[PDB]
Structures are given as C-alpha cells and as structure tokens.
C-alpha cells in the first residue's frame, strides 16, 4: 500500500560512513589560492556527523589518484549493515570538476562509484554529497568566491547539496570557516537528530541567504549575496533519529 | 507563542493572500519543420491534467499552445511585470522538448535563465520572498525525421538533455528527468512525470509540504517499468526525476479561507 509519508529504513547496525575530503593548499602549477578556514569546517563537520552516529573519516590534501583510490575503496566495501552514506568535499571547483591537490576530478565519476550497479549494498539507501567548492580567486577575513560548480543531481536516492548557486557567491571566514558549512553544522547540531533532512537543508538555505552583504569589511564584497541549493533525487523521507 | 520572534525551524511561507497566484502552462506539441523535432503526442493530456490540479489548488491557470519564441517571451514578460502583491506564489510549467540550458518554443529555443531571470528580485518585487515554482517536462526529441517540411497508446522514450539547474532564492525548479536517465510519455495517457505529479497533487497536494510531495513523485516515477511484452527497446531506460530547491521555508497549499 502506497504510503505518502514513507521513510528510509534507518534501522541498521551502523549509521554509516561519512567521508570528508579537505583541501587547504594546491600544487603551485594549478595557481590556486589557499583556503584558510577550511580546517574549522572539517572539525565542525566531524563533530556534527559523529554526533549523528556516522563513522567519520577525513583526508587532507590528497592527490587526485590517492583520492580516487580511497573513494573507490570505500565504494567496494559492504554497506549492508549501514543506513546511508555521506561524502563531503571541501575545495575549489569548476563546472563539473572539483580540485584535488594536483588536478581536478569529475564529480560524476565520484558519484557514479555509488550508483546501484557499482555498489549493491547502498541500493535504496540515501547517498548524500555535500559540496563546498567555488572559483578560487587568482585575524578573521571573509573571502568571497564566485559560484563555478554546476549544481547537478546524481541518480536515484542521491542528495546533492551545494554551498552556492550560479550567479551567487560563496563566503569563507579565515577563522570561523565557510558561511555554508557553519550554518549547516549549526542546524545539524540543533535539529539534525529530529528534523527531516531536506527540511533542515531548507533552513540552511534561509540562514545563508539572510547573511547580510550590505556592509563589508572589504568594500569589494558588498552586495555579493550567497544562496545555497540542493538537488534531490531521494524517494523517501530522511531522518537521523538517535539509534 | 503569545507572539512570535526568532529563528523557527518550522517556518512556512505565508499563504494568506487574497489569491493563490497565477499558473502559466506553456504547451508544445508541434515544431517548425526546420528544427527537425518530432511531435509530442500526449502533451495535451498533460496540459489538461495540470490545469485541473492547479485550479483545484486555487491557482488562476493560463495555458498557451505552440507559441513562437517571441510570443512566449512577450507573454511571460507581461506576467512578470504586473503586480503579484495579492498573490501567494507563482507557478510556471513548460511542456516541450529541450537541450542543455534551452527549452524549445515553436520556432526556436529559449534559455531557461532568461525565463527565470524575469522574476528575480526587484525585476519582480511583488514576488520577492514568495515561492516561484518552475516545472519542466522537456528532454531530447528523437530526431529520426526528415529536414523537409511535411490512435493507440504508445510509450515514447527520450534521453535527458536539459540541465537540472536552480534559479535564485525562493525558486523551486522541478525536472521530469535527470542526466543519465530517460523521460517517458504515453501518446494517450501523457507523461509519466506529469501523470504521477497530478495524481499526487490530487491526493496530497492540499495538505503535504510541496517538496515532500515532489519526493513522492520521485519514488512513483522511479518505480515505473515499461511493459516488456509490448515494446521493448525500453528495457532499462529508467526514469528518475529531480528538483533543485532554493526555497527558504516550508511550502503548503492548504485550502484558502
Ligand atoms: O551539466 C552540465 N554539463 C555541461 N557540460 C555544461 C553545463 C553548463 C551549465 C550547467 C550545467 C552543465
């Protein structure tokens, strides 16, 4: 019988794995600026997801090959005992690509590793990608980057979450971290274990979009609004109730 | 509370206005021969289905069939320049073929961003902070017809071709199909996506949070299979819809007082 309020079964032994790929520096040949404040983001995300029951694993400044290797490895182990899978990318990006330390990687090749055919044990389970990546511009300072990464979906039961949409600007405080991640972690901390996750993501939309850009320490950044977005191909309601 | 103040996890868009708003439907069944695009039989069923559903939700529905690009732009520019001060929200539906950032009018294609850009910010002040909902049934027209000018229920299968992009704060962009998948349309019953959308609207539209309803449509469509026995090039051409939300509050269509 069709249930209008059906929920993903979050009954399994483990919540699941949460991967964080953190990129603060890039090979000089790429000519990309450092991302000060990204370590605050990584730490913030680690605490939130960990409190949600996730097994969190972080990797700092991996080369492209090492990154592919690691995520392929994760995609080929069994997730039969897990509720879901989370993957977070903290870097710069361009169009369909995100930057590793030495080269860029296609987002689709990363998400494709978890598509039903390649990862049977995640079939029918939420696969959540959180992407903080924009165009690298070539005390607590706020750095403003233009949106650059296409806010695309990824397949059934995938949820793709983006820090910023085309036409808007991503912000990152060198001490406090990224606007998007801060607001995301805040909402996770307060409401993560009760609220339906796309409703929580909507709160993050509101929170970030309301951050005022009329008076900036840097007059260059005045009026450069930030609005996030998410592209959902989930098929059920997603909650992270305490296990 | 006794009165309200600070950040509320359950804040809803105010759906308190005199009118629900306008719902535009742009319906395209045929195309100028030079575009070499196939007809879209079944789209009129889609148009009628959507009209009854949105009308029951209180929308003022206006349909336009097979408009040329210039006429289309003119009409949507006209809607974007009137006052929506007495409206809760705005809905715009495209039923056509498309490619990348483009949707096809009768004689040419139009960039989606130029369409949505008309309702951004102070370009349309009276819709600022209000849900602006675009529903797009558009994919790649199978082009095994000629660049010359020339009753049963068949299911047509089209590859996803339109980028599933977002559009600005308080915009919700709804797509029949995502990249890598296929859109289906029955020549009599209409599009898989629109049928399931309309069925969920009818049954749940007037109480369910609209993105939660869209998620129901994701599940419904993703679970459909074509009859093998029956015509079977369609095996394994799965359809999975998606929506890109930049909404900032919960969206409901409770019956208006
Ligand atoms: O998905 C995309 N692929 C390619 N390719 C280009 C593009 C441009 C804008 C928005 C999205 C896209």
In sequence order, what DSSP letters do the residues of A47-74 get, joined into one string?
HHHHHTT-EEEEEES--HHHHHHHHHHH
| Rounded distance between C-alpha atoms, residue B2 and residue A68, angstroms | 55
Approach to solving: X-ray
Judging contacts by C-beta atoms under 8 Å, the chain A residues touching residue B165 are: 150-151, 166
Rounded Cα gap, residues A79 and B117, in angstroms: 43
User: What single-letter DSSP state applies at residue B255?
Assistant: P
Distance CA B64, CA B198 (A): 19
Q: After which residues is chain A broken (C to N over 2.5 A)?
A: 138
Give, using CA atoms, the residue closest to atom 1 of ligand 1: B163
Q: Report CB contact under 8 Å: A206, B165.
A: no
B149 CA: distance to closest CA in chain A (Å):
37
Q: Do B248 and A196 touch (CB under 8 A)?
A: no
Distance of alpha carbon B76 from alpha carbon B233, whole angstroms: 38
H or E, element range at B72: helix B69-81
| Token pair for B183 | 């859109």
* Close Cβ partners of A181 (under 8 Å, ≥ 6 residues apart): A41, A44, A45, A90, A132, A163
User: For residue A225, how far is its CA from the centre of ligand 1 (angstroms)?
Assistant: 22
Residue A207, min C-alpha distance to chain B (Å): 8
Are B20 and B58 spatial neighbours (Cβ–Cβ below 8 Å)? yes
What's the CA-to-centroid distance between A90 and ligand 1, angstroms? 21
As a whole number of angstroms, the distance between CA A232 and CA A95 comes to 19
Looking at chain A, which residue has its C-alpha nearest residue B199? A4
How many angstroms does the Cα of residue B3 sit away from the middle of ligand 1?
A: 47
User: CA–CA separation, B181 vs B161, rounded Å?
Assistant: 9
- Mutational pocket test of ligand 1: of A150, A152, A164, A167, the residue with most ligand atoms within 8 Å of the beta carbon: A150
The answer to whether the CB of B22 falls within 8 A of the CB of B59 is: yes
Ligand 1 centre to CA of A38 (Å) is 27
State the Cα–Cα distance between residues B213 and B197, nearest whole angstrom.
Answer: 8
Separation CA A133–CA B54 (nearest Å):
38
Chain-centroid distance of CA B18 in Å reads: 24
Distance from C-alpha of A240 to C-alpha of A14, rounded to nearest angstrom: 12
Whole-Å CA distances, A40 to A37, A56, A178, B41: 5, 15, 8, 55
Q: Give the Cα-Cα-Cα angle A107, A112, A117 (nearest 5 degrees).
A: 175
Q: How far apart are CA B84 and CA B81, in angstroms?
A: 9
What CATH number does residue B239 fall under? 3.40.50.1460
Q: Inspect the interface and report whether the beta carbons of A231 and B244 lie closer than 8 Å.
A: yes
Tell me which DSSP letter residue B233 carries: G
Query: Chain A residue with minimal CA distance to B249?
Result: A202
**Which residues does a 6 A CB cutoff place in the pocket of ligand 1?**
A 96, 150, 152; B 163, 165
Q: Distance from B114 to chain A by nearest Cα, in Å?
A: 13
- Find the domain containing B65 and state its range: 1-257
β-partners of residue B186 are B155, B190
Q: Between A152, A166, A202, which is nearest B164 by CB?
A: A152
Resolution to 1 decimal place, in Å = 2.1
Residues of A in contact with B247 (CB under 8 A): 202, 205
Chain A nearest C-alpha distance from B223 (Å): 10
Query: Hey, how many other C-beta atoms are within 10 angstroms of the C-beta on B14?
Result: 11
How far is the C-alpha of B151 from the C-alpha of A131, rounded, in Å? 48
Residue B199: burial class (beta carbons within 10 Å; 0-12, 13-18, 19+): middle
Residue carrying the six token digits 């979050």: A10
CA distance A209 to A213: 10
The answer to whether the beta carbons of residues A21 and A91 sit under 8 Å apart is yes
Nearest chain A residue to B246 by CA distance is A229
**Ligand 1 centroid distance, CA of A96 (Å):** 7
């Amino acid at each position: 019988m069709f249930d209008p309020a059906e929920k993903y079964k979050m009954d399994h032994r483990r919540r699941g794995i949460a991967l964080i790929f953190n990129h603060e520096r890039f090979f000089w040949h790429l000519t990309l600026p450092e991302r000060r404040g990204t370590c605050a983001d990584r730490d913030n995300l680690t605490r939130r997801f960990s409190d949600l029951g996730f097994e969190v694993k972080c990797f700092n400044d991996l080369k492209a090959e090492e990154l592919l290797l690691k995520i392929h490895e994760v995609s080929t182990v069994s997730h039969a005992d897990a509720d879901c899978f989370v993957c977070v990318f903290l870097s710069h990006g361009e169009g369909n690509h995100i930057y590793a330390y030495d080269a860029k990687i296609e987002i689709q090749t990363l998400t494709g590793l978890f598509k039903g055919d390649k990862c049977h044990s995640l079939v029918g389970k939420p696969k959540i990608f959180i992407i903080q990546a924009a165009r690298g511009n070539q005390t607590n300072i706020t750095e403003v980057d233009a949106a650059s990464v296409y806010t695309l979906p990824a397949g059934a039961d995938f949820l793709m979450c983006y820090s910023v949409a085309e036409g808007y600007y991503s912000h990152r405080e060198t001490v406090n971290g990224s606007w998007y991640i801060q607001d995301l972690c805040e909402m996770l901390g307060k409401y993560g274990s009760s609220l339906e996750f796309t409703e929580l993501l909507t709160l993050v939309n509101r929170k970030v979009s309301q951050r005022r850009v009329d008076f900036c320490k840097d007059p260059s950044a005045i009026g450069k609004k930030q609005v996030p977005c998410f592209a959902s191909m989930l098929t059920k309601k997603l909650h992270f109730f305490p296990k």
